[PDB]
Write a protein that binds this DNA or RNA. Sequence first.
RNA 1: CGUGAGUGAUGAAGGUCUUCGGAUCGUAAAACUCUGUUAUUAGGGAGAACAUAUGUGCACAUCUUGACGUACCUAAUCAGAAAGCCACGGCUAACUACGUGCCAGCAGCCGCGGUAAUACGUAGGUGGCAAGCGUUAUCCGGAAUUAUUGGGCGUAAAGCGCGCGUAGGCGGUUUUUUAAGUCUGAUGUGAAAGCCCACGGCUCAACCGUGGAGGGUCAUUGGAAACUGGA
Lengths: 156, 198, 130
Amino acid sequence: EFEERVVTINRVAKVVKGGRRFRFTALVVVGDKNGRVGFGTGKAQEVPEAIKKAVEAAKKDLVVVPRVEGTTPHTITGRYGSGSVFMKPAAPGTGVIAGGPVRAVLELAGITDILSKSLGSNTPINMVRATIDGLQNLKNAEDVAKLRGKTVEELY
Amino acid sequence: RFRGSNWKKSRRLGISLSGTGKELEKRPYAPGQHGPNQRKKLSEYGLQLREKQKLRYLYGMTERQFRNTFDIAGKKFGVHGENFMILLASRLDAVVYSLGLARTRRQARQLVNHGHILVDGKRVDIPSYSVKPGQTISVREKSQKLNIIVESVEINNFVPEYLNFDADSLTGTFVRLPERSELPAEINEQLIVEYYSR
Amino acid sequence: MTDPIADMLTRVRNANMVRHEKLELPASNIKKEIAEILKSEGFIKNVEYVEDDKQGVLRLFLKYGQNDERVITGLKRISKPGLRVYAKASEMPKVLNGLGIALVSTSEGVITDKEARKRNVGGEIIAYVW
RNA sequence: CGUGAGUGAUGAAGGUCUUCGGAUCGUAAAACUCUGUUAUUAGGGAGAACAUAUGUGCACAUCUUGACGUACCUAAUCAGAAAGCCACGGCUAACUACGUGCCAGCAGCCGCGGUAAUACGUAGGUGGCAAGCGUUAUCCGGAAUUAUUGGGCGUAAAGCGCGCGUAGGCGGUUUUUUAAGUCUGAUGUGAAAGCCCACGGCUCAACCGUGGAGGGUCAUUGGAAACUGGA
């Protein structure tokens, strides 16, 4: 019903009074299995109760990503923090591979025609923030038609 | 042309389509160095480069030697996105992968001498043959019955479209028009239709 | 007046944000069909006829939904004084293949973009007030 | 064409890491068959195309050539060898044992050297790519970075302390003008180591006709004034 992508569970070796406190920050993408990105981080002792903790406290950070005719409406970027991304269009009837950054952004948008792009670095805390920067800065067909305030077939 | 192991094509790439079982006795996890770790997510330009490297082990002609292949899958008019799977099946490996001579593409490129080659007249010992409506990729007079040409004559029953093959003949001369969706679909189309353009 | 549609662009846009049914755009000699060029579709809804005296003021008569839904998501300026955006036989744009009407005026006065490619001309639509 | 496996014995005689646990450099492999695509002599043979009794209005007759003369190739089917160098903890697809131990190496980014540097040097190697590989000076991916799409008028990349003055850069004046103007008009031409809509073959290379098509034309007002700075 909901494509939840739990990337990893960052641990911490707290060097406080206690011998060695264990704090697992379960990282899970809050995707709605449609086209939204979704990102939430927990801090509970139980990963299962921590993964849903960030899914019930952070589920409004997603963005609606529409599709034209099976191809990305506009090749957007991502200038938020170090890690960056890029939207590359492909044919509707295609697929994705492995080797690079995060995979829970274009995989949520069941279309198999978008290539997930994010160089920046490996840090998965400032690389997903740039993906939502471009997703919210995406240009739609009518979205840009209102900008001019004329016809949809008069701005292409 | 690669002069290396033909078992790393289903490990470094994400679209091999050259053998049925390969990860049965191997380890289908991630890469090599961090094979016991998690996998990654192909980058925008990386996915188009991964497919190129994936087809680099599949297609005999590598970078610069497959000029025509890439030139026929770009400037050529028509579905540019699916032009990499449409105008790219004009090699000599397709005839061996439709009649029943070689199950692989690398072995199909070396099957232009041991197997059927005489395409109704002038033959060709290259990885691509000019098989058009009128060419019958068959064998020679002395090499009429070969061992690699008549190997899986009964083992390979099901044949592909736009191809012909019979007993003691294996001469392909059916339809010249092929399908642009009659090949594996794991790589992007518009991605390679734009990246190549540059 | 330094800019012809100076207040015009700062009226409808502001009236489409604060939900202003009736608008008060300073009417001029060319500020009539330029502020009502989308009267064919429904972007700027429609109006009866510019009624005033020697460039006084013209309304836009904007309409919204039940919970005040604006069809236009902010209007920006494109074809202004100085530069000229004349679309000849170079390349006509397309998005949804026919929907509303834009700025394509030649020798037929105010026409739609449906036959824009047929005429192969791209000018600015204008009209006098009363 | 590119240099041998149709076949194929843990494919070893014992080593590659070996706490030996197995796999294997190892469906490497024997020793042949196989694979033809190496010789053995060979005789070989387009820019530029019409002629020379005296019988012939930009048409042409007895009689006018060689500085040569072994692509793709299924064929004789002798056996003529794709190695390599680089990162290897990596960044960035990549390693095991020894030897080193701020001695030396490594050494773009990282850094690794004062002890357990598989980062060092040898051996077994591994990722890459392609008859090779590391190097030096030369455009652009890198990224807009005198901002032009690609700069502020405050910390950032930004307070002329200069309070008094026209650099013509530029700062409502109603109406109002004789036509600065937006889209029509001579079109024949419309050619082009030009992206020619096709057009020719040299397998891996240089084998070139299409001026109307063909855009890369060479109808865009003479013109419809209530209007940047100046009323």
